Amino acid sequence: GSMQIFVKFRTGKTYTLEVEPSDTIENVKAKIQDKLGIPPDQQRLIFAGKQLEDGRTLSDYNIQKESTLHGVR
């Protein structure tokens, strides 16, 4: 399956991203690189005050459709 989330950067810019529940966090970082040109080695992803850890999945963190991730490069 699929869902649309948001990724919000410290600049205020917020982008849509199309993910799957099964996706690992490092897979999400790969999608960000495809859309925005930020390599995964310059990304950290935060949901609701926790840093998302690469080897876990979105579903492991209770990410819902239309949730917003904050990123730090």
Q: What is the CA radius of gyration of the chain?
A: 11
Quickly count: other Cβ atoms within 10 Å of residue 60's Cβ: 13
Residue 38's domain spans which residues? 1-73
* Residue 23 CA from chain centroid, whole number: 10
Q: How many domains does the chain have?
A: 1
What is the DSSP pairing of strand 44-47 with strand 68-72?
antiparallel
DSSP-based helix, strand, coil % in the chain, nearest 5: 25, 35, 40
- Give the resolution in Å: 1.1
Question: What method did the depositors use to determine the structure?
Answer: X-ray
